[PDB]
Amino acid sequence: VQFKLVLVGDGGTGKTTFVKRHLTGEFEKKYVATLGVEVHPLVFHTNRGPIKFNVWDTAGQEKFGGLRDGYYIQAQCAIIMFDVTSRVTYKNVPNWHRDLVRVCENIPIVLCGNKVDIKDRKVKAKSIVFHRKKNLQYYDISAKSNYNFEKPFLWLARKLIGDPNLEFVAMPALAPPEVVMDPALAAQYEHDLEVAQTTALPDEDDDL
């Protein structure tokens, strides 16, 4: 039960950061432009069973676009991303949507305005209307604060499985093993732990 999901939008809007947050839980602060596409499997556990997304995270920068719309072939859903702090990225949403629906004529699509954690918002909520005539779902999101970060996948799962009452459920938690530490390298995790002890945790000014 797997579905191909293509993720498109201007460079720097947070597509790869959003996926990585869902993949590993991390928040990547650095901007390393995606080269063409990166494919990652992503599984959610639902009350209707597991759903697997094959996430095709495409490049937004034209100079790194690779196969461009070739990535959209046989997609079953999509996320269009823009950055509420960059008006140009919302102005390009109709261009990404055009190229996407020319290949994928009848798929569920979520429009996501990312980076709502930033105080100086530029794309006002009242002006976000492109989704209405195009039957896209819309969410404000923040990959940094996790605001609404699950809602695009929850909505897509509901449309793809065909069950509006689908919800995410807690994955079962097997009993963890009882392993004693290794005395052959016990004198070594002094080093790997000292390094970790003296490397400051990021974002110490956050509520958590």
Ligand X SMILES: Nc1nc2c(ncn2[C@@H]2O[C@H](COP(=O)(O)OP(=O)(O)NP(=O)(O)O)[C@@H](O)[C@H]2O)c(=O)[nH]1
Shortest Å, Cβ 175 to another protein: 7
Please list the residues that pair with 6 across neighbouring strands: 56, 78
Q: Is 30 annotated as a binding residue?
A: yes
11 known member of a binding site: yes
Q: How far is CA 103 from CA 6, 60, 77, 150, 176, in A?
A: 11, 17, 12, 26, 46
Largest CA distance in the chain: 65
Continuous segment of H or E residues that includes residue 57:
strand 49-58
Q: Is 120 among the annotated ligand-binding positions?
A: no
The answer to the question of whether 144 is labelled as a binding residue is yes
Contact between 58 and Mg ion by CB under 5 A: the answer reads: no
Rule CB under 6 A: is residue 61 a binding residue for ligand X? Answer: yes
88 binds ligand X (CB under 6 A): no
The count of residues interacting with ligand X (CB under 6 A) is 23
Report the nearest approach of another protein to the CB of residue 77 (Å).
15
Looking at the Cβ atoms of 48 and 121, the one nearer to another protein is: 121
Rounded CA gap, 9 and 95, in Å? Answer: 9
Count Cβ atoms below 10 Å from residue 65 Cβ, excluding itself.
Answer: 18
Provide the annotated binding site for GTP.
10-17, 28-34, 60, 114-117, 142-144
